[PDB]
């Protein structure tokens, strides 16, 4: 076990956990939570970054002295990957984008980069690999995002046979694009929904649950070559979910139906932004697509995680979207939404 890696302490900030983890995409929504959980137990965390170092400041208080090391890397350069994964025994892949830039498309961030990471980790002696895919990933979906997800998942499996693949569904949290996305369309007067959102089912999952599941899969010997599905305890209709979101935010809910072609056209119009798009055609496709049900796959309860319902965590995300009049309203005042459970 390489004595220098033998766990020591009480699992606190100054303890030794025996984990040396290279976390790709640690400057994202899920990456901050994963790095926070890793640094809580006293793990050596290696953060490869390509952005401005300022955008990594929030990751610095998350570890003890010397326990978080920031190194530059290039997605298309395998030497950078080898540099950042040389001394690690765990590699976690959280690289992903919800839109295509002029330099990286969906098959560059979901197929090429994950495959390169997996191959270099396998040839560098890395013992554990964690790869994040989507729950609704399949090669015949109308969304290029999910097709690239499925192709990259199978390619990562080919390159790293004993890798752990985790497929969450619609992660919600403070810095998410699920609850914030629906709360932010109040500025357009109405809420456009395809078929009024009455034929879509969503099973969102809490961000802390996903981070805990990743951490537990890191230290689970039996989870070497398995595939996990991370879903929440409740399935909602899209209409009911958005109505509950607007009720928690205390905003007037004025939904209207929009045909698929018109909504796709507005997504294409918003795609022209040189900055982060407000919405895209792929985002429209993924929002109005029902969540797959894969009961044969292991879930959070098989890693010891009890999935947290949206009702106990929606206020911590949606209280920012309230006005001053409703800013102090409590949690149990909003009458939890109707659930399509079985």
């Amino acid at each position: 076990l390489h004595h220098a890696l033998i766990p020591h302490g009480k699992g606190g900030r100054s303890s030794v956990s025996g984990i040396v983890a290279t976390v790709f995409g640690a400057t994202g929504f899920l990456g901050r939570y994963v790095v926070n959980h890793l640094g809580r137990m006293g793990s050596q965390v290696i953060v490869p970054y390509r952005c401005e170092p300022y955008d990594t400041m929030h990751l610095r208080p998350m570890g003890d002295l010397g326990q978080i090391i920031f190194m530059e890397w290039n997605g298309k350069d395998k030497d950078s990957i080898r540099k950042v994964v040389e001394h690690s025994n765990v590699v976690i892949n959280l690289v992903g984008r919800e839109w295509e830039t002029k330099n990286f498309d969906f098959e560059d961030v979901f197929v090429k980069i994950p495959h390169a990471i997996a191959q270099v980790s396998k040839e560098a002696g890395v013992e554990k690999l964690i790869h994040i895919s989507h729950l609704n990933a399949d090669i015949k979906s109308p969304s290029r995002y999910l097709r690239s997800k499925a192709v990259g998942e199978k390619e990562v499996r080919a390159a790293f046979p004993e890798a752990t693949i985790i497929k969450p569904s619609d992660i919600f949290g403070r810095e998410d694009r699920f609850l914030n996305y629906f709360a932010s369309m109040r500025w357009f007067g109405g809420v456009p929904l395809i078929s009024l959102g009455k034929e879509t089912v969503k099973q969102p999952v809490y961000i802390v649950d996903v981070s805990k599941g990743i951490i537990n899969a890191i230290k689970d010997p039996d989870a070497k070559g398995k595939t996990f599905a991370f879903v929440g305890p409740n399935r909602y209709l899209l209409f009911d979910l958005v109505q509950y979101i607007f009720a928690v935010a205390y905003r007037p809910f004025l939904p209207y139906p929009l045909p698929h072609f018109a909504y796709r056209w507005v997504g294409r119009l918003f795609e022209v932004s040189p900055f982060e798009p407000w919405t895209t055609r792929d985002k429209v496709e993924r929002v109005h697509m029902s969540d797959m049900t894969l009961p044969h796959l292991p879930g959070l309860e098989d890693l010891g995680i009890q999935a947290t319902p949206l009702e106990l965590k929606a206020i911590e995300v949606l209280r920012r979207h309230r006005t001053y009049r409703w800013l102090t309203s409590e949690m149990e005042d909003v009458k939890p939404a109707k659930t399509v459970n079985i």
Partner: protein
């Protein structure tokens, strides 16, 4: 000997004497003082199992414990045996005794041999230094049989020298004429002389009769040979002749046994079978080596496909021949109870924690019991010491040395066996200083004792 371990930043720096007027006075032995560095040399840090190639490889605690538990669940009764080493604490001994009893096994043995004829270990005074160390300064004559007290028990020899100097003590030895640092009357090395003294034909017998407070000390090393029972019977005959002739002076306790193993007296108090002969009579399928690094039992004396489990703190002669290795704590890394050669129970304290994944020995045994399904009734150190009190109450009195005198019953029960003595001269294992430095695993791993042996062999 009462000692002080001085540590700094979780590392043992040195060993110093701690003053105990009745045991070590103000002094310690060179082995006590300078063998501590052997605790940093060949250490078991992680659990190990055998892989597909037959080589020892590192393993988590869970898998090694599950393997041992699965092998233990298969066999039962006589097929499971355990041998205790020389540096095993009372808590670990009682835990192993309970664990093997739940399987209905009684083959709990020690490498050191003590005769079981007559009383055997049934009466405590049969295997104790009844006079005690402080009592040496009251005797007017002492007879030493088949021992080298200078190297077997250096502080006992220092006490004898002190009484020889100040109280004009008269000393006689039966055995090899070793240098004891004081002049003594050497009677020879033939064991038959013992019988002559009992007979009264010998000149020395009169000398014991005139003495007000005679003492007879028999080394446990002489009991390791084939005729140990006969030697013990002859020594008991001599002591009984003294007691019958001179009468009872009071609570003087003429008869003594000098031990050299720190774990022997506690094991005998707990009911461990002395010697290994029980295992050689009925070879087991599963063998527990609780720090047994003496080499008494090898894989030639065992059936093939024998599951050997070694639990210790050092990689020595007993570890490479095992299938599962469980790293344990050393005497500086646990609060453990050891019983004196005079019967005095004492307890160590934790100075540093065990290195790596090493754990306390009784905790290892209790975890293994829980994994295997026969959970032991104790979870903490206080509960396991309550169990120790349940088995032998003297193991919780931590400075008491008083005990009963059952010499009459043991002497009567030793007469029913008439085993013949051997015409082989008594030779102690330690004959010169060079043999003193390396006796157990810690001192054999010590680099300072290697220097001492090299300096003694070639002075340069």
């Amino acid at each position: 000997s009462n000692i002080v371990v001085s540590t700094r930043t979780g590392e043992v720096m040195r060993i110093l004497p701690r003053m105990h007027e009745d045991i070590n006075e103000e002094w310690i032995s060179d082995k006590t003082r300078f063998a501590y560095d052997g605790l940093k040399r060949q250490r078991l840090t992680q659990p190990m199992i055998r892989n597909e190639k037959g080589l020892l490889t590192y393993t988590t605690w869970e898998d090694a414990l599950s393997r041992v538990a699965g092998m233990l669940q298969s066999f039962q009764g006589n097929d499971v045996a355990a041998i205790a080493g020389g540096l095993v604490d009372a808590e670990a001994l009682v835990a192993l005794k309970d664990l093997l009893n739940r399987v209905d096994s009684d083959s709990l043995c020690t490498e050191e041999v003590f005769p079981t004829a007559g009383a055997g270990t049934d009466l405590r005074s049969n295997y104790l230094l009844n006079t005690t160390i402080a009592g040496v300064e009251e005797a007017d004559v002492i007879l030493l049989v088949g021992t080298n007290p200078r190297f077997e028990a250096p502080l006992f020899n220092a006490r004898i020298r002190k009484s020889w100097l100040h109280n004009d003590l008269k000393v006689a030895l039966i055995g090899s004429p070793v240098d004891l640092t004081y002049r003594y009357d050497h009677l020879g090395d033939s064991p038959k002389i013992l019988q002559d003294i009992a007979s009264g034909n010998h000149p020395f017998s009169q000398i014991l009769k005139e003495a007000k407070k005679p003492m007879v000390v028999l080394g446990s090393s002489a009991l390791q040979r084939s005729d140990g029972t006969a030697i013990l019977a002859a020594v008991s005959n001599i002591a009984q002749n003294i007691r019958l002739s001179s009468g009872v002076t009071g609570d003087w306790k003429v008869m003594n046994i000098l031990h050299r193993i720190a774990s022997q007296v506690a094991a005998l108090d707990l009911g461990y079978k002395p010697g290994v002969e029980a295992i050689r009579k009925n070879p087991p399928k599963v063998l527990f080596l609780l720090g047994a690094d003496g080499g008494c039992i090898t894989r030639q004396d065992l059936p093939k496909d024998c599951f050997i489990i070694y639990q210790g703190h050092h990689g020595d002669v007993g570890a490479p021949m095992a299938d599962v290795i469980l790293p344990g704590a050393a005497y500086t890394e646990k609060s453990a109870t050891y019983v004196n050669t005079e019967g005095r129970a004492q307890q160590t304290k934790v100075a540093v924690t065990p290195p790596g994944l090493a754990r306390e020995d009784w905790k290892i045994i209790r975890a293994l019991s829980e994994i295997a399904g026969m959970t032991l009734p104790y979870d903490t150190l206080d509960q396991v010491r309550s169990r120790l009190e349940e088995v032998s109450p003297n193991l919780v009195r931590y400075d008491d040395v008083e005990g009963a005198n059952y010499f009459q019953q043991a002497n009567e029960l030793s007469k029913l066996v008439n085993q013949q003595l051997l015409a082989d001269p008594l030779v102690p294992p330690q004959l010169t200083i060079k043999d003193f430095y390396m006796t157990d695993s810690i001192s054999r791993a010590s680099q300072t004792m290697a220097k001492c042996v090299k300096a003694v062999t070639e002075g340069i």
